[PDB]
Each structure stands twice: as C-alpha cells, then as structure tokens.
Design an enzyme around this catalytic site. Structure first.
Site, PDB file in Angstrom:
ATOM      1  CG  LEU A  18      -2.364  -6.089   6.131  1.00  0.00           C
ATOM      2  CD1 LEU A  18      -0.794  -5.199   6.167  1.00  0.00           C
ATOM      3  CD2 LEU A  18      -2.630  -6.895   7.255  1.00  0.00           C
ATOM      4  N   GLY A  19      -6.128  -2.991   5.023  1.00  0.00           N
ATOM      5  CA  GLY A  19      -6.962  -2.161   5.082  1.00  0.00           C
ATOM      6  C   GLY A  19      -6.990  -1.097   3.925  1.00  0.00           C
ATOM      7  CE  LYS A  20     -10.683   4.401   1.695  1.00  0.00           C
ATOM      8  NZ  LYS A  20     -11.980   4.822   1.476  1.00  0.00           N
ATOM      9  N   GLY A  21      -5.867   2.895   2.646  1.00  0.00           N
ATOM     10  CA  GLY A  21      -4.811   4.161   2.743  1.00  0.00           C
ATOM     11  C   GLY A  21      -4.677   5.273   1.765  1.00  0.00           C
ATOM     12  N   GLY A  22      -5.881   5.589   1.496  1.00  0.00           N
ATOM     13  CA  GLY A  22      -6.142   6.917   0.649  1.00  0.00           C
ATOM     14  C   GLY A  22      -5.932   6.228  -1.035  1.00  0.00           C
ATOM     15  CE  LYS A  25      -8.426  -1.341  -4.643  1.00  0.00           C
ATOM     16  NZ  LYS A  25      -9.437  -1.715  -3.583  1.00  0.00           N
ATOM     17  CE  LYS A  41       0.883   4.018   2.487  1.00  0.00           C
ATOM     18  NZ  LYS A  41       1.460   5.641   2.229  1.00  0.00           N
ATOM     19  CG  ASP A 135      -0.768  13.569   8.921  1.00  0.00           C
ATOM     20  OD1 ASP A 135      -0.989  12.534   7.844  1.00  0.00           O
ATOM     21  OD2 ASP A 135      -1.611  13.793   9.585  1.00  0.00           O
TER      22      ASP A 135
HETATM   23  C1  LIG Z   1       0.560   0.156   4.975  1.00  0.00           C
HETATM   24  C2  LIG Z   1       0.282   1.309   5.488  1.00  0.00           C
HETATM   25  C3  LIG Z   1       0.341   1.448   7.407  1.00  0.00           C
HETATM   26  C4  LIG Z   1       1.881   1.467   7.506  1.00  0.00           C
HETATM   27  O1  LIG Z   1       2.480   2.357   7.068  1.00  0.00           O
HETATM   28  N1  LIG Z   1       2.475   0.379   8.159  1.00  0.00           N
HETATM   29  C5  LIG Z   1       3.905   0.615   8.555  1.00  0.00           C
HETATM   30  C6  LIG Z   1       2.002  -0.832   8.500  1.00  0.00           C
HETATM   31  C7  LIG Z   1       2.442  -1.796   9.299  1.00  0.00           C
HETATM   32  N2  LIG Z   1       1.772  -2.693   9.600  1.00  0.00           N
HETATM   33  C8  LIG Z   1       0.195  -2.861   9.493  1.00  0.00           C
HETATM   34  N3  LIG Z   1      -0.557  -3.721   9.825  1.00  0.00           N
HETATM   35  C9  LIG Z   1       0.088  -5.106   9.828  1.00  0.00           C
HETATM   36  C10 LIG Z   1      -1.015  -5.854  10.002  1.00  0.00           C
HETATM   37  N4  LIG Z   1      -2.065  -5.093  10.366  1.00  0.00           N
HETATM   38  C11 LIG Z   1      -1.530  -3.877  10.313  1.00  0.00           C
HETATM   39  C12 LIG Z   1      -2.775  -2.846  10.499  1.00  0.00           C
HETATM   40  C13 LIG Z   1      -2.260  -1.695  11.108  1.00  0.00           C
HETATM   41  S1  LIG Z   1      -3.454  -0.802  11.124  1.00  0.00           S
HETATM   42  C14 LIG Z   1      -4.722  -1.688  10.262  1.00  0.00           C
HETATM   43  N5  LIG Z   1      -3.926  -2.944  10.081  1.00  0.00           N
HETATM   44  N6  LIG Z   1      -0.413  -1.781   8.887  1.00  0.00           N
HETATM   45  C15 LIG Z   1       0.386  -0.800   8.321  1.00  0.00           C
HETATM   46  N7  LIG Z   1      -0.203   0.187   7.681  1.00  0.00           N
HETATM   47  C16 LIG Z   1      -1.681   0.145   7.554  1.00  0.00           C
HETATM   48  C17 LIG Z   1      -2.360  -0.586   6.350  1.00  0.00           C
HETATM   49  C18 LIG Z   1      -3.766   0.140   5.908  1.00  0.00           C
HETATM   50  C19 LIG Z   1      -3.572   1.531   6.875  1.00  0.00           C
HETATM   51  C20 LIG Z   1      -2.505   1.565   7.567  1.00  0.00           C
END
Ligand SMILES: CC[C@@H]1C(=O)N(C)c2cnc(-n3ccnc3-c3cscn3)nc2N1C1CCCC1
Length: 285
Positions: A18-22, A25, A41, A135
């Site tokens: 889904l991406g990066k978060g400090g 992963k 996470k 934040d």
């Molecule tokens: C896991 C961290 C954060 C989060 O807290 N939630 C609830 C979330 C809930 N849903 C998504 N999500 C689901 C499908 N695509 C995403 C997304 C949101 S921003 C980049 N991908 N991502 C979330 N994220 C993303 C993952 C990387 C950075 C932030």
C-alpha cells in the site's frame, strides 16, 4: 504469504503493498476468519531496537486501540511474530485528502463543509476521550469507498496534560506548529484547533497560512500569527479561519462553536459527495 499469530493461531493473508509509513511497510492484510481486508503497518523489530522508538509504537497502539468512532480510523488488532510488529486498521480505499488536494489543487466550499464536518466530529470524540491528535494534516484524513472521512495516524498522539503538568518540548515534527507550542507552553486542545485553521485554509487555497518547514526562521511569523488573507475567500470562510488561527489559544472557538458558524449553516452542504470529486470539480448548487 500466510501470516500466523504465534499466541493465538489466527491466520492472515498478506495482499498488495500500500505504501510507506516511516517504520511501517504497508500491505493489505486479510483476516481469514472474518474474511475482511485491512490496511496493515508491518514493522520489523530491527527498525525499533532503540528503547524510545519501541515505546513510540507502544503508546500509539495503547492509545489508538481504545477508540471507537465513525470518523476515527478503527483499530482492529495488533500482534507480533518472530520478526514483525503488525497493526491492522480500517481499510480506506480512496486514500487520503492530501491525495485529493494534489489532484484538485483547490476544493469548492460545499466540499470543504462536507469534509470539515466529519473532521470536527472525529476530533470532538478524541477530545472528550481526552486524547490530543497532535498531527492533524490533510495526509491523515483517510477516505473510504463510500466517501467517509476517518482521522488517522495516532502516534504523535497523547493524553491531555494540565498546563502545570505539561510536556513543553516540541513533540516530533508536525505539519502545523501552534504559536503556544513555540512559546514552550506545550500542546493543548486549542493547538489541534490551530491546525484545523491551517487545514481549512489549505482546502480552500492549496497552500498553508504559514511555512511548514519547521525551521527556526519560521517561528516569528507564526507567533505573531500574522499572514495574508486572499481576497478570493468569501466573507464567512475568512472569519472562521481568522477565528481558529487566533494568536492566543483561549481566543480560539470550541468545536461546537466551529460546526455552528455561518460558514457551515448559511451554505448548502451535500450528504453524499461523489467519488468524481477525487479528480473533477462538482456541479454548482
Ligand atoms: C497503514 C497506514 C495508513 C493508515 O493508518 N490507514 C488507516 C490506512 C487505511 N487505508 C489505506 N489504504 C488502503 C488502500 N489504500 C490505502 C492508502 C491510503 S494512502 C495510500 N494508500 N492506507 C492507510 N494507511 C497508509 C499506508 C501507507 C501510508 C498510509
């Protein structure tokens, strides 16, 4: 990829990245038992060997897991196996508001009303729980398929401390530093309201009221709380931004005061925003 919880025997299925978060992963994580997908996470232990970054995620889990509200990202479950820490959260398929604002540059007033009503709802909940987000930014407002805003990323989150019992040093490195934090007074509830001014401003203009470099050059202008109000803004929007961005913390409106302002009451606001608004401008009225 099957992920088994060593203390329960619960089996999960790891999906797409889904991406990066400090330290995070981020991958999709299906609970095989339920049968539902979450946004996980995944933090390898190697990342958090230091006592303070270990404690960091520990407070984030401890504080987040106790919140149950329609406009706060739902904690589901946390566990650890031999190498990774796992935090499963409400899957928000249409990402965050930082994503929408890139694609739109600037939102219409009824869109700003639609999103901020949800933001203030989720923050009221938190502030009654007595937890400060610390934040709030467009990046942390997560949107689902059906277009509903969830406030997420706890983490710089903390329990409200009385003024005399308060942490004075600047916590982490947030998007919108308040005048009072810069005066070594700590981060109250009105410091969260400050950020809502910076948020609302950016939704309507596509640029923050102050520089977000956190550089010490930037400190004076913020204190001070002086900035340019663009003429493009309508009267009611202008007043509420100036209200939330008051120099003195106790001059800022309450969250109840906020959702009842002319900005909200005297304009049209839809019940359901279309997903086209993630890209395209919506129709008038
Ligand atoms: C896991 C961290 C954060 C989060 O807290 N939630 C609830 C979330 C809930 N849903 C998504 N999500 C689901 C499908 N695509 C995403 C997304 C949101 S921003 C980049 N991908 N991502 C979330 N994220 C993303 C993952 C990387 C950075 C932030």
């Amino acid at each position: 990829r099957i992920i088994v919880d060593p203390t329960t025997g619960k089996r999960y299925s790891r999906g797409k990245t889904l991406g990066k978060g400090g330290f995070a992963k981020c991958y999709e994580m299906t609970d095989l038992t339920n049968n539902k997908v979450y946004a996980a996470k995944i933090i390898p232990h190697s990342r958090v060997s230091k006592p303070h970054q270990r404690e960091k995620i520990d407070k984030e889990i401890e504080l987040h897991r106790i919140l149950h509200h329609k406009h706060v990202v739902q904690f589901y479950h946390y566990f650890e196996d031999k190498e990774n820490i796992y935090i499963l959260l409400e899957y928000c398929s249409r990402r965050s508001m930082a994503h929408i604002l890139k694609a739109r540059k600037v939102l219409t007033e009824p869109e700003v009303r639609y999103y901020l009503r949800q933001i203030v709802s989720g923050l009221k909940y938190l502030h009654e729980q007595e937890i400060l987000h610390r934040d709030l930014k467009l990046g942390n407002f997560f949107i689902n398929e059906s277009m509903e805003l969830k406030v997420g990323d706890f983490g710089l989150a903390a329990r409200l401390e009385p003024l005399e019992h308060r942490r004075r040093t600047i916590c982490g490195t947030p998007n919108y530093l308040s005048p009072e934090v810069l005066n070594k007074q700590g981060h109250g509830a009105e410091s969260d309201i400050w950020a809502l001014g910076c948020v609302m401003y950016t939704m309507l203009l596509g640029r923050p009221p102050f520089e977000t470099t956190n550089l010490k050059e930037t400190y004076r202008s913020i204190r001070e709380a002086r900035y340019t109000m663009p003429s493009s803004l309508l009267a009611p929007a202008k007043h509420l931004i100036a209200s939330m961005l008051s120099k003195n913390p106790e001059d800022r409106p309450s969250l109840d005061d906020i959702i009842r302002h002319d900005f909200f009451t005297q304009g049209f606001t839809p019940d359901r925003l279309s997903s086209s608004c993630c890209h395209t401008v919506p129709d008038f009225h």
